[PDB]
Structure 1
C-alpha cells in the first residue's frame, strides 16, 4: 500500500499531462469566444501534473509532505469553478462569479487545511470540517442553480458538468471524516489520487464538450 500509493502518483502524473495536452490540442476545434474554459481546464491539469511529480518524489524520499495536496487543491479547486463559469457566463456576470465562487472555494480548502493540520477528532478538526462542509454545500447549490434556464444540448452538456462535480467530489469530505471512524490514511491517499485524475481530466473533457456544443458542434 506504500508502493501502490507511489505507482498511483506516477499514473496520476502521466494522466494529468495527457489531459493538459489533449485539452490544449482540442482547444483549436472550438470557436475563440468559447476557448477560455478549455484553456483553464488544461491549466488545472498542468498544475496537478506538476504537483503529482512533487508528491511522487516527496513520497519516495520518506517524510511525505501532506501539505502539497492542499497547495494543489487551493489553486485547482477555485480554477475548476472558474472553468465551469467560463462556459456558463461572460462579461460582468462571469467576473462576479469568478470572485465570489473563487473566494468561497479558497475558504473551503483553507478551512480544510486548518482542520487537517489538527489532531483528528479535535475541536480544530471539527471547526475546519464544518466551515469547509458549509462552503461545499453553498458551492454545490450555486452549481445546481447555474443550470436553470439552459435548453436542449447545452442543458444536457451542463447536467454532465454539474453531476461530475456533485458525485465526483463527495469522496473529498468522506476521506476527511474517515480517520475519525478508524485507520484509513493509506486508502485515503490512493482514493484521493484516483479521484483527482477523474475529476480534473473528466471536468476538462466535459467543459470542452460544452464549448463544442456552444460552437455549433
Structure 2
C-alpha cells in the first residue's frame, strides 16, 4: 500500500498538469465568451498540480502532511463552485450563492482537517466527521436544486456536472473513514488522490463540454 500510494501521488501529479495544459489548449475550441470556465478549470488543476508535487514528496519522506491536501481543498473547492453557479445565476443571486457555498465548503474542509488530525476513532475524529458530513449534505442538497427549470442540451450538460459532484465527492467521506475500517491509513490517501483526479480533471472536461454547448456546438 505504501509504494502504491507513492506511485499514485506521482501519477496524479502529472495528471493534474496534463489536465491544466489540455484545458488551456482546448479553450480555442469554444467561443471566447465561454472560455472563462475553461480557464478557471485549468487554474483548479494548476493549483492541484502545485500541491500534488508537494504531497508526493511529503509522502515519500515518511512524515506525511495532510495539511498540503486540505489547503489545496480549501482553495480549489470554492473555485470549482464559481463556474457551476455561473450556469444558473448572475448578479446578486450569483454572488450570494458563491459566498454561501464557499463559506460552507470552508467549514466542511476545516471541520474535516480538525477531525483528521485528531486521534483516529476519537470523539474529535467523529465530531469533525459529523460536522463535515452535515455541511456536505447541505452543499449537495443546494446543488441538486440548481438548474431545475433547464431544458435541452444545456440541461443535460449541467446535469452531468451535477452528477459528477454528487457521485464523485462521495469518495472523500469514504477515504476519511477508511482508517477506522481497517489498517488502511494509506488507502485514505489512495482514495483522496483518485477522487481529486476524477473530480478536478473530470469537472474541467465537463465545464469544457458545457462551453461547447453554450457555443452552439453539437
TM-score normalised by structure 2 residue count? 0.94
Three-state SS of the structure 2 residue aligned to 1:128 is helix
Please state how far the C-alpha of 1:28 moved relative to its aligned partner.
2.4
Once the two structures are superposed, residues 15-49 of structure 1 have per-residue CA deviations (whole angstroms, 9 ceiling, x without a partner) of 10111111112222223332222211111100111
Q: Distance in 2 between matches of 1:28 and 1:101?
A: 30
Indicate conservation of the 8 Å contact 1:24/1:42, yes or no: yes
RMSD: 1.3
Please state how far the C-alpha of 1:107 moved relative to its aligned partner.
0.9
Q: Distance in 2 between matches of 1:196 and 1:117?
A: 20
Please state how far the C-alpha of 1:65 moved relative to its aligned partner.
1.1
Structure 1 residue ranges, 4+ long, deviating more than 6 angstroms after superposition: none
Three-state SS of the structure 2 residue aligned to 1:118 is coil
Moved more, 61-70 or 46-55: 61-70
* Structure 2 residue runs without a partner (length 5+): none
Q: Distance in 1 between matches of 2:45 and 2:131?
A: 27
Residue in structure 2 matched with residue 147 of structure 1 by the alignment: 147
Count matched residues: 217
Q: Distance in 2 between matches of 1:212 and 1:43?
A: 19
Please state how far the C-alpha of 1:75 moved relative to its aligned partner.
0.9
Three-state SS of the structure 2 residue aligned to 1:88 is coil
Indicate conservation of the 8 Å contact 2:157/2:210, yes or no: yes
Please state how far the C-alpha of 1:90 moved relative to its aligned partner.
2.6
TM-score normalised by structure 1 residue count? 0.95
Once the two structures are superposed, residues 91-113 of structure 1 have per-residue CA deviations (whole angstroms, 9 ceiling, x without a partner) of 32222211111111111100101
* Structure 1 residue runs without a partner (length 5+): none
Q: Distance in 2 between matches of 1:27 and 1:86?
A: 17
Q: Distance in 2 between matches of 1:89 and 1:27?
A: 22
Please state how far the C-alpha of 1:83 moved relative to its aligned partner.
2.5
Q: Distance in 2 between matches of 1:27 and 1:39?
A: 7
Change in CA separation of 1:196 and 1:55 when aligned onto 2, cut-off 3 Å: same
